[PDB]
Design an enzyme around this catalytic site. Structure first.
Site, PDB file in Angstrom:
ATOM      1  N   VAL A 107     -15.403  -5.029 -12.781  1.00 13.74           N
ATOM      2  CA  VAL A 107     -16.781  -5.508 -12.841  1.00 13.74           C
ATOM      3  C   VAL A 107     -16.853  -6.875 -13.521  1.00 13.74           C
ATOM      4  CG1 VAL A 107     -19.084  -5.028 -13.774  1.00 13.74           C
ATOM      5  CG2 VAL A 107     -17.732  -3.183 -12.735  1.00 13.74           C
TER       6      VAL A 107
ATOM      7  N   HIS B  41      -4.988  -4.341  -6.262  1.00 16.02           N
ATOM      8  CA  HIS B  41      -5.538  -5.662  -6.524  1.00 16.02           C
ATOM      9  C   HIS B  41      -5.961  -6.362  -5.237  1.00 16.02           C
ATOM     10  CE1 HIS B  41      -5.743  -9.936  -7.445  1.00 16.02           C
ATOM     11  NE2 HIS B  41      -6.076  -9.545  -8.662  1.00 16.02           N
TER      12      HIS B  41
ATOM     13  N   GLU C  37       6.976   1.686   6.633  1.00 13.59           N
ATOM     14  CA  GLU C  37       8.207   2.116   7.288  1.00 13.59           C
ATOM     15  C   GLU C  37       8.391   3.632   7.249  1.00 13.59           C
ATOM     16  OE1 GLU C  37      10.129  -0.628   4.877  1.00 13.59           O
ATOM     17  OE2 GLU C  37      10.887   0.806   3.383  1.00 13.59           O
ATOM     18  N   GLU C  38       8.011   4.289   6.147  1.00 14.95           N
ATOM     19  CA  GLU C  38       8.276   5.721   6.053  1.00 14.95           C
ATOM     20  C   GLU C  38       7.410   6.540   6.990  1.00 14.95           C
ATOM     21  OE1 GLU C  38       9.042   7.288   2.125  1.00 14.95           O
ATOM     22  OE2 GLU C  38       9.712   5.276   1.558  1.00 14.95           O
TER      23      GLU C  38
ATOM     24  N   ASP D 127       9.624  -5.986   1.362  1.00 12.33           N
ATOM     25  CA  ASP D 127      10.147  -5.265   0.200  1.00 12.33           C
ATOM     26  C   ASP D 127      10.404  -3.794   0.544  1.00 12.33           C
ATOM     27  OD1 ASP D 127      11.033  -4.994  -2.449  1.00 12.33           O
ATOM     28  OD2 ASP D 127       9.098  -4.141  -3.050  1.00 12.33           O
TER      29      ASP D 127
ATOM     30  N   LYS E 243     -15.357  -8.017  -8.773  1.00 10.09           N
ATOM     31  CA  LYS E 243     -14.709  -7.252  -7.705  1.00 10.09           C
ATOM     32  C   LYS E 243     -15.469  -5.972  -7.374  1.00 10.09           C
ATOM     33  CE  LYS E 243     -10.198  -8.959  -9.223  1.00 10.09           C
ATOM     34  NZ  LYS E 243      -9.412  -8.834 -10.442  1.00 10.09           N
TER      35      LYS E 243
ATOM     36  N   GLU F  19     -13.112  -2.966 -15.762  1.00  9.07           N
ATOM     37  CA  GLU F  19     -12.468  -4.278 -15.828  1.00  9.07           C
ATOM     38  C   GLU F  19     -12.796  -5.111 -14.591  1.00  9.07           C
ATOM     39  OE1 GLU F  19      -8.631  -5.954 -14.948  1.00  9.07           O
ATOM     40  OE2 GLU F  19      -8.074  -5.592 -17.078  1.00  9.07           O
TER      41      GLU F  19
HETATM   42  N1  NAD Z   1       8.664   5.390  -1.211  1.00  9.00           N
HETATM   43  C1  NAD Z   1       8.618   4.313  -2.017  1.00  9.00           C
HETATM   44  O1  NAD Z   1       8.290   4.426  -3.197  1.00  9.00           O
HETATM   45  C2  NAD Z   1       9.063   2.952  -1.497  1.00  9.00           C
HETATM   46  C3  NAD Z   1       9.842   2.796  -0.342  1.00  9.00           C
HETATM   47  C4  NAD Z   1      10.261   1.506   0.046  1.00  9.00           C
HETATM   48  C5  NAD Z   1       9.859   0.414  -0.710  1.00  9.00           C
HETATM   49  N2  NAD Z   1       9.103   0.627  -1.813  1.00  9.00           N
HETATM   50  C6  NAD Z   1       8.652  -0.515  -2.549  1.00  9.00           C
HETATM   51  O2  NAD Z   1       8.356  -0.433  -3.931  1.00  9.00           O
HETATM   52  C7  NAD Z   1       7.321  -1.392  -4.295  1.00  9.00           C
HETATM   53  C8  NAD Z   1       6.475  -0.803  -5.406  1.00  9.00           C
HETATM   54  O3  NAD Z   1       5.727   0.267  -4.920  1.00  9.00           O
HETATM   55  P1  NAD Z   1       4.108   0.291  -5.045  1.00  9.00           P
HETATM   56  O4  NAD Z   1       3.586  -0.899  -5.815  1.00  9.00           O
HETATM   57  O5  NAD Z   1       3.609   0.761  -3.711  1.00  9.00           O
HETATM   58  O6  NAD Z   1       3.769   1.479  -6.042  1.00  9.00           O
HETATM   59  P2  NAD Z   1       4.602   2.198  -7.221  1.00  9.00           P
HETATM   60  O7  NAD Z   1       5.166   3.440  -6.570  1.00  9.00           O
HETATM   61  O8  NAD Z   1       5.405   1.305  -8.074  1.00  9.00           O
HETATM   62  O9  NAD Z   1       3.254   2.668  -8.008  1.00  9.00           O
HETATM   63  C9  NAD Z   1       2.418   1.721  -8.650  1.00  9.00           C
HETATM   64  C10 NAD Z   1       1.510   2.491  -9.574  1.00  9.00           C
HETATM   65  O10 NAD Z   1       0.623   3.290  -8.764  1.00  9.00           O
HETATM   66  C11 NAD Z   1       0.307   4.520  -9.358  1.00  9.00           C
HETATM   67  N3  NAD Z   1       0.760   5.688  -8.588  1.00  9.00           N
HETATM   68  C12 NAD Z   1       1.957   5.851  -8.018  1.00  9.00           C
HETATM   69  N4  NAD Z   1       2.059   7.071  -7.452  1.00  9.00           N
HETATM   70  C13 NAD Z   1       0.917   7.735  -7.658  1.00  9.00           C
HETATM   71  C14 NAD Z   1       0.406   9.083  -7.324  1.00  9.00           C
HETATM   72  N5  NAD Z   1       1.125  10.045  -6.653  1.00  9.00           N
HETATM   73  N6  NAD Z   1      -0.851   9.316  -7.694  1.00  9.00           N
HETATM   74  C15 NAD Z   1      -1.595   8.448  -8.401  1.00  9.00           C
HETATM   75  N7  NAD Z   1      -1.174   7.211  -8.768  1.00  9.00           N
HETATM   76  C16 NAD Z   1       0.063   6.821  -8.419  1.00  9.00           C
HETATM   77  C17 NAD Z   1       1.127   4.546 -10.689  1.00  9.00           C
HETATM   78  O11 NAD Z   1       0.350   4.197 -11.829  1.00  9.00           O
HETATM   79  C18 NAD Z   1       2.224   3.461 -10.539  1.00  9.00           C
HETATM   80  O12 NAD Z   1       2.600   2.834 -11.749  1.00  9.00           O
HETATM   81  C19 NAD Z   1       6.596  -1.785  -2.994  1.00  9.00           C
HETATM   82  O13 NAD Z   1       6.816  -3.144  -2.644  1.00  9.00           O
HETATM   83  C20 NAD Z   1       7.242  -0.898  -1.919  1.00  9.00           C
HETATM   84  O14 NAD Z   1       7.412  -1.397  -0.626  1.00  9.00           O
HETATM   85  C21 NAD Z   1       8.706   1.819  -2.210  1.00  9.00           C
HETATM   86  N1  NAD Z   2      -3.064 -10.808 -14.796  1.00  3.91           N
HETATM   87  C1  NAD Z   2      -2.933  -9.892 -13.836  1.00  3.91           C
HETATM   88  O1  NAD Z   2      -2.658  -8.712 -14.090  1.00  3.91           O
HETATM   89  C2  NAD Z   2      -3.113 -10.342 -12.412  1.00  3.91           C
HETATM   90  C3  NAD Z   2      -3.667 -11.598 -12.101  1.00  3.91           C
HETATM   91  C4  NAD Z   2      -3.818 -11.954 -10.754  1.00  3.91           C
HETATM   92  C5  NAD Z   2      -3.373 -11.080  -9.775  1.00  3.91           C
HETATM   93  N2  NAD Z   2      -2.863  -9.882 -10.121  1.00  3.91           N
HETATM   94  C6  NAD Z   2      -2.332  -9.072  -9.073  1.00  3.91           C
HETATM   95  O2  NAD Z   2      -2.237  -7.660  -9.298  1.00  3.91           O
HETATM   96  C7  NAD Z   2      -1.109  -7.097  -8.558  1.00  3.91           C
HETATM   97  C8  NAD Z   2      -0.452  -5.919  -9.268  1.00  3.91           C
HETATM   98  O3  NAD Z   2       0.224  -6.400 -10.360  1.00  3.91           O
HETATM   99  P1  NAD Z   2       1.764  -5.953 -10.581  1.00  3.91           P
HETATM  100  O4  NAD Z   2       2.149  -4.796  -9.676  1.00  3.91           O
HETATM  101  O5  NAD Z   2       2.554  -7.149 -10.897  1.00  3.91           O
HETATM  102  O6  NAD Z   2       1.655  -5.127 -11.928  1.00  3.91           O
HETATM  103  P2  NAD Z   2       0.636  -4.053 -12.580  1.00  3.91           P
HETATM  104  O7  NAD Z   2      -0.030  -4.850 -13.683  1.00  3.91           O
HETATM  105  O8  NAD Z   2      -0.170  -3.350 -11.573  1.00  3.91           O
HETATM  106  O9  NAD Z   2       1.771  -3.152 -13.269  1.00  3.91           O
HETATM  107  C9  NAD Z   2       2.598  -2.316 -12.477  1.00  3.91           C
HETATM  108  C10 NAD Z   2       3.213  -1.324 -13.418  1.00  3.91           C
HETATM  109  O10 NAD Z   2       4.105  -2.032 -14.308  1.00  3.91           O
HETATM  110  C11 NAD Z   2       4.152  -1.514 -15.589  1.00  3.91           C
HETATM  111  N3  NAD Z   2       3.657  -2.397 -16.645  1.00  3.91           N
HETATM  112  C12 NAD Z   2       2.538  -3.133 -16.605  1.00  3.91           C
HETATM  113  N4  NAD Z   2       2.333  -3.781 -17.778  1.00  3.91           N
HETATM  114  C13 NAD Z   2       3.333  -3.416 -18.597  1.00  3.91           C
HETATM  115  C14 NAD Z   2       3.701  -3.724 -19.972  1.00  3.91           C
HETATM  116  N5  NAD Z   2       2.893  -4.493 -20.729  1.00  3.91           N
HETATM  117  N6  NAD Z   2       4.837  -3.217 -20.443  1.00  3.91           N
HETATM  118  C15 NAD Z   2       5.624  -2.398 -19.723  1.00  3.91           C
HETATM  119  N7  NAD Z   2       5.307  -2.023 -18.462  1.00  3.91           N
HETATM  120  C16 NAD Z   2       4.218  -2.525 -17.852  1.00  3.91           C
HETATM  121  C17 NAD Z   2       3.143  -0.306 -15.554  1.00  3.91           C
HETATM  122  O11 NAD Z   2       3.762   0.972 -15.381  1.00  3.91           O
HETATM  123  C18 NAD Z   2       2.223  -0.558 -14.332  1.00  3.91           C
HETATM  124  O12 NAD Z   2       1.691   0.608 -13.737  1.00  3.91           O
HETATM  125  C19 NAD Z   2      -0.164  -8.291  -8.202  1.00  3.91           C
HETATM  126  O13 NAD Z   2      -0.145  -8.500  -6.795  1.00  3.91           O
HETATM  127  C20 NAD Z   2      -0.812  -9.462  -8.952  1.00  3.91           C
HETATM  128  O14 NAD Z   2      -0.585 -10.743  -8.358  1.00  3.91           O
HETATM  129  C21 NAD Z   2      -2.705  -9.499 -11.387  1.00  3.91           C
END
Ligand code: NAD
Ligand code: NAD
Ligand code: NAD
Ligand code: NAD
Lengths: 336, 356, 336, 356
Positions: A298, A261, A109-110, A211, A302, A296
């Site tokens: 590997v 993922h 969207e952005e 979302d 993946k 991880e």
């Molecule tokens: N602008 C926005 O952040 C925005 C706008 C609308 C909706 N959302 C919603 O928020 C939800 C969560 O966002 P997401 O999972 O895309 O990511 P997130 O912004 O939560 O980031 C996930 C992880 O990616 C890594 N990351 C983030 N920014 C980074 C950077 N500049 N460089 C390197 N690594 C970085 C970080 O470890 C972070 O924990 C999504 O469903 C999305 O649609 C976000």
């Molecule tokens: N076991 C698994 O991790 C697993 C299994 C199957 C699929 N996946 C897929 O991976 C995708 C990404 O996973 P996600 O965004 O739910 O989370 P993520 O594991 O990528 O975590 C997102 C952020 O949440 C925070 N976080 C993670 N673990 C934490 C902890 N122990 N305590 C506090 N903060 C914590 C961290 O800042 C991290 O950057 C999902 O779509 C999921 O279905 C994951």
């Protein structure tokens, strides 16, 4: 055995030489140099011709995108589209340098909203109460006036009306990728990532497309015009097929979460990616997928055992333009 | 003599702090070991220990609000939300990343859901599937440093410092395929319009095991939202199944209406969010629809500097309207595997009698 | 092979059972359980008697501290003395549970200052301009009114006068550890870590003792009363000798920086520590010593190859009191 | 129809931002690759790229101030500071953690010191010794994941993803021991009162190699402060040497007077601090003696949540008086191995002509 040595500025500011010196500088500078090598390996593979046997197999998808010897998946979190990295990504997509995009809803969207109104610089410390009183939304050290979303509403509503009509009278079965292609066609603006993606037949996957603001608008719209369906199952088949029928694959993943993922899991379907670069700020200690090292992946299959993946531990706003400068931008002629 | 400007800079007079000001003081082990007193002392210990104490206070405020009696039209609530769950004085949204279900925090979450202590769950796909798989086969302890090549050669998958054998997913496949067959048949001949939350409720009913989070969620009419439910092993299985039995559709639009109306029609809301990503944003964005959550606790390991939503402080969400300006939200910067069981011990688990 | 399982609150709030369940909970909860095991192993070794041969060798130092079968080095950054962990550390030192302390200058001075005036809770977001206008100094989410340091000046100056007189007329050769023992004796207050340390013959090392308020005061004092010398070389010999003549050693290190390296480097002099627990929030990717995993120290010989060291990736304000509750506090009778 | 309160919350009117407001926009590679333009575009890219652009501006402000002509009594300055270094219009303090000298950032720092572009260096002990050792034998690239047991068995020491053979320290020992002999003799019969900075100047003179930071520092009368100089290999060597040749004393009190007076008697000060720990605090605390630095740039990977000094934001230092209230300090949250060479390219290296 390679010796540590940094760039010597007694040579002057030779910017290419300075960047090429990161490889022997150590710590994340060395990982940056390794990432340059890995991306350049993806590009050199991509430009290799398909043999007869390879072409036969790669052609087994329904995709309109031309076949190449390396299918590159580019993933990025939503905040990177809020940032100026939006321009970096748009360039790669405009010139057919990557083959599949994966982003979260904000990352869709952005890009569209930036064609209607800009995002501005702010500061991380700005307090929410005063911002909210003024309808200014904060994204890190960036600011989006809420009128930007009001403009999005005015632009998107008629398109949602047509989508529902096409679903109900022309049998269209919408999915996130099909919606994103339609939105890119409608925005009809060469500054937009999604305009170029649909023009170049690069599919965009975003399973949680509800979302974000797009969700807000679908939600409000559903009261006046009920029944829009966005199926995530067909889009799973579509992304997975891109990996299964690739000659080779590379993954360039900026950030974590679903984007990281979802790309990696698609590549498990072919028993692993051949090349992989992660650029993210997450760490492994919390058990997160976001913070997992390439090794991880590997263990799951993946990433191939014989791959040499790289992670750069850094904010991609700093690293990604430099990476592109040293890789895709140097091969621009080959892509036109 | 010492330079006057240096003396003036270092020895500057200070104002008196307000009388209400709280002194820093750690637990004194000369008292022995009283674990309740030890946990209470985190509030005055400083840094993230103080944030933990503040999180306890915020969660206890949510619970106390939830337990206040209500007088509301059960029929109107139900129509507008299309939910059978009765409204309480505070609707609590609990979100957690998938890895936390791989961890023993699965047991902590299962307890809260078993006792109907929260109203809405949000998790990513792994956080659904691994709860079900744990009813078929266990996850094991390992180490972060184990090398991927040797693990892959032995059919073992790594999740942080945890390990899941390939065979766990084989058992999942065998269990799930007949259920997917029934879901397709019900869609095509009984008019069922599947969404992630509807599927998750069905899987919880099918697993029929009181160790499962999702078994208890469906029994208690606690919906589970997961708009990217295809990103994981459940996705793998849906994918493979679709070539044997085509047709399954999972719609995310109806699930957006369901979660958003849970927020809109609440009397009060609280958010307890473990980790970041979709789970954090999806809960917070639903609460924007009511002009903000009344209470909020984040426990996550992300940092703001990268601009990420995961790492954004609660005060960023205030700017959007996702958290009310008059709220007093808290973030604890820590691994939830350490902090969340302690938090539950000092909050929900102390109110067990009121929840029965 | 141990299965993952969290504590089941259907059993009630059985706090000891809840803590013991961290071991099978995963991620850093599992590392906490491992840290409990490692510290308990240090304690069980410490309580083992010295044989005749072991006693002969351990007795080869000039130290007044009684010999034990495991010399435990406890290191902590200055901010942990600003926090309530000051009380946790004071308890261990009061009851002779550790043998050598290492901290930075703030970790010395703030323990003394807390006997004169308290530190208060604040917030990380408080703005510096308004705080400075009011003479309120910020330490994270804590606040120290500057009058606290004015009280420190009034208390410390006469002691510095005596130290200079003793140097010039009684041949005293000051070092940081000798100064810290003197300050602990002078504060003469059972709430003070350094009071108990000097009473119990536990030496305190802090090679950069000038980096803080103690430095400020030594600096101002040197204009009126010149020539105080603080030698760091003798203190290097003193810390290293504690490791060289130990039967066994354990390292409990909270935070990073000089404290962590100085303890580890002393233990290299005996070809490595037998037991080690790190609790810190640093990460390895920047190449820092603070963020290095225990296994980096194994490459140097600072931790034995046969050791089973543990790092907990967490803020020690959360973890350290729980660790003490499950280790030293359960063996309190053995220490009295 | 859509709930009115939800529409009102999501579609709230916004105020207009000031006209000076800067739009986000990344570098457009359709221009080709102009690396200067690429680096300039970081300012409008957001997140830490924007902080990098702000850091460039702050460092360039320090340099421009330093180059402004001055009119000052050279004799009084020298007496009060006990330094031969002439005063300029801005005294720049450069601090870096030891690992950055293990890295190729050693070459970046050496360039600045060679050309007299900074006035005071602060580093920990490793940051002294590894510069000298690199003149005797190289450091090599490795990987973070290499296991300690196998490295130790092969006589290789790990520094992050770098590797140093044991033999490097054997060469250091052979080089250093005769110098330590001379230092003890000079202390006992020529009245020399050694401190870390005095020792570091002597070691730089002895290494007599233009690849060395400390060779250039002593040639240019740039002092180096390192109050815990015993925490490293130089300490090991002093320790072993003292059993063959007792008596060496290193006083830290005189070095505190020297660094603090550098700040007190400055016209203006700037701080460029890479990393945290002693180096960051010791520079900042010296600047409290003048009621604060005028300019400050931090580049470090620490975070505030643990209460650490390393992770404290510049605005914490403002509360103490270490940074002036009217300053505009900047922190870049990044590994300095990536950012510092880029920073130098856009600042000091562009002003090479003015520094000659
Ligand atoms: N602008 C926005 O952040 C925005 C706008 C609308 C909706 N959302 C919603 O928020 C939800 C969560 O966002 P997401 O999972 O895309 O990511 P997130 O912004 O939560 O980031 C996930 C992880 O990616 C890594 N990351 C983030 N920014 C980074 C950077 N500049 N460089 C390197 N690594 C970085 C970080 O470890 C972070 O924990 C999504 O469903 C999305 O649609 C976000
Ligand atoms: N076991 C698994 O991790 C697993 C299994 C199957 C699929 N996946 C897929 O991976 C995708 C990404 O996973 P996600 O965004 O739910 O989370 P993520 O594991 O990528 O975590 C997102 C952020 O949440 C925070 N976080 C993670 N673990 C934490 C902890 N122990 N305590 C506090 N903060 C914590 C961290 O800042 C991290 O950057 C999902 O779509 C999921 O279905 C994951
Ligand atoms: N209260 C103070 O912070 C204070 C007061 C006076 C002087 N100083 C000076 O600042 C200098 C630098 O301080 P330092 O090296 O002691 O440490 P620091 O505070 O810079 O911390 C060093 C590292 O230790 C780890 N750490 C810090 N706090 C932690 C926590 N709560 N839990 C887990 N890990 C943590 C972090 O990774 C951090 O990067 C010292 O010379 C000291 O005298 C500090
Ligand atoms: N090569 C070595 O690291 C080495 C060698 C010999 C002795 N030592 C000893 O270890 C002790 C501790 O070292 P220290 O406190 O100087 O630093 P450190 O390496 O412990 O780093 C302190 C903090 O600085 C920041 N930092 C570190 N590397 C960074 C990078 N690449 N970019 C940005 N920020 C970064 C991090 O937040 C880190 O927590 C010193 O007394 C030193 O003499 C270290």
């Amino acid at each position: 055995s390679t010796q540590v040595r940094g760039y010597d500025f007694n040579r002057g500011v030779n910017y290419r030489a300075l960047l090429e010196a990161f490889g022997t500088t150590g710590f994340q500078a060395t990982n940056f140099g390794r990432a340059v090598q890995q991306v350049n390996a993806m590009i050199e593979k991509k430009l290799e011709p398909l043999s007869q046997d390879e072409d036969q197999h790669a052609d087994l998808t329904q995709s309109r995108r031309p076949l190449t010897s390396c299918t590159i998946f580019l993933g990025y979190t939503s905040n990177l589209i809020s940032s100026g990295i939006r321009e970096t990504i748009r360039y790669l997509v405009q010139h057919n340098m990557v083959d599949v995009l994966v982003t979260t809803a904000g990352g869709v969207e952005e890009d569209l909203i930036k064609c209607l109104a800009p995002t501005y610089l702010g500061e991380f410390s700005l307090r929410g109460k005063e911002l909210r009183e003024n309808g200014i939304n904060r994204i890190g050290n960036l600011l989006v006036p809420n009128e930007n979303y009001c403009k999005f509403e005015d632009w998107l509503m008629p398109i949602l009306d047509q989508m529902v009509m096409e679903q109900n009278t022309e049998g269209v079965k919408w999915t996130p990728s099909k919606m994103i292609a339609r939105l890119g066609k409608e925005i009809n603006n060469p500054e937009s990532v999604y305009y170029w993606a649909q023009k170049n037949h690069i599919p965009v996957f975003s399973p949680a497309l509800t979302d974000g603001s797009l969700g807000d608008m679908i939600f409000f719209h559903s009261y006046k015009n009920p029944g829009l369906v966005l199926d995530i199952v067909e889009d799973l088949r579509l992304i997975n097929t891109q990996a299964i029928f690739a000659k080779c694959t590379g993954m360039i993943i900026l950030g974590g979460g679903v984007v990281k993922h979802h790309i990696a899991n698609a590549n498990l379907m072919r028993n692993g990616a051949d090349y992989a670069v992660y650029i993210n700020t997450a760490q492994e200690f919390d058990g997160s997928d976001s913070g997992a090292r390439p090794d991880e992946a590997v263990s799951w299959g993946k990433i191939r055992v014989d791959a040499q993946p790289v992670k750069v531990y850094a904010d991609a706003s700093l690293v990604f333009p430099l990476l592109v400068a040293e890789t895709f931008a140097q091969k621009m002629d080959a892509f036109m």
